[PDB]
Ligand code: HEM
């Protein structure tokens with residue numbers, strides 16, 4: 019999976035940045051959360067919160083790293099029943115400035131807490147310090163860079179003719195990158211206690227209010243998989259619930275993925291174009307048969323992520339949102355279209 023390298027290196031740039039010199043301070047947050055010490059949590063944040071304004075030399079990297087370190091306090095304060103912007107003076111203007119500097123929402127996202135978060139024991143930021151949280155973060159680190167590579171490959175595949183042997187080849191490569199999502203779920207199912215997730219981790223992921231609206235807490239739901247699938251199969255879907263789902267999470271993904279999304283909203287999806295071409299040319303063409311077959315395997319790997327993921331989520335929530343089952347159904351229907359072309 020040679021394409022992963024560059025994405026992982028960009029993540030590592032943010033992970034290596036500590037512009038507020040906050041590492042040793044943020045590591046004390048788990049203890050304070052365990053003690054439910056709200057004044058203490060506010061006090062610890064005020065030790066490094068740049069209430070006077072952001073240093074002028076900062077770029078995206080520093081601002082994202084700053085949002086990461088302040089971010090864990092945001093989830094923590096809400097977990098104890100407090101709007102962070104209401105209990106921390108001068109916090110809201112800092113959060114809005116960091117949002118400006120990153121073109122991201124004014125709170126921590128999945129990216130901040132996982133790939134932009136250093137991995138070492140003496141550096142990794144966490145809400146709880148629990149081994150289950152460490153496993154949860156690792157599960158996302160397994161597949162994020164591969165997913166970003168997969169988005170790039172999907173956009174490239176879009177302009178590849180089914181009549182070309184490249185279609186089958188690019189589809190096979192895409193499947194290999196998407197396999198990492200399956201590995202993530204396997205890991206999460208093996209290593210994360212459902213009870214510890216539901217009782218101890220879940221409380222830290224509530225929404226907070228900043229700038230007169232609500233921003234969702236970090237979650238793997240924020241992974242730009244929905245952008246990949248928008249391009250792949252979903253862009254022209256008439257399912258209103260599905261459209262609402264994608265529009266909900268769009269703000270939380272990187273600006274480049276929001277632009278990819280907008281680019282393809284007014285186009286037929288890859289699947290639609292590929293099926294139209296297969297039907298136009300005939301299935302007697304060997305490159306058409308091979309292209310569709312390889313494309314079917316892309317849907318197979320998506321289902322091998324999505325179906326086990328539903329079980330993972332239902333197991334935790336038995337200690338799950340209907341959105342999950344509905345999306346699974348949509349994905350089966352998409353694969354069925356491909357199977358029907360080959361039949
Ligand atoms: C114990 C671990 C996990 C639990 C309890 C869980 C729970 C959920 C829930 C309840 C949803 C529905 C949206 C929401 O209400 O937040 C969701 C969506 C989603 N989750 Fe997870 N999740 C877990 C692990 C993971 C992992 C490890 C990944 C991938 C690395 C992942 C990827 C996704 C994605 C991409 C969605 C959007 C819906 C979809 O594509 O099917 N989740 N998750």
Ligand SMILES: N[C@H](Cc1c[nH]c2c(Cl)cccc12)C(=O)O
Pocket residue numbers: 128131154155158223236237238239240
């Ligand atoms: N809300 C679920 C579970 C979740 C909450 N927070 C999470 C992190 Cl920080 C990483 C993975 C999963 C995760 C999801 O969105 O997948």
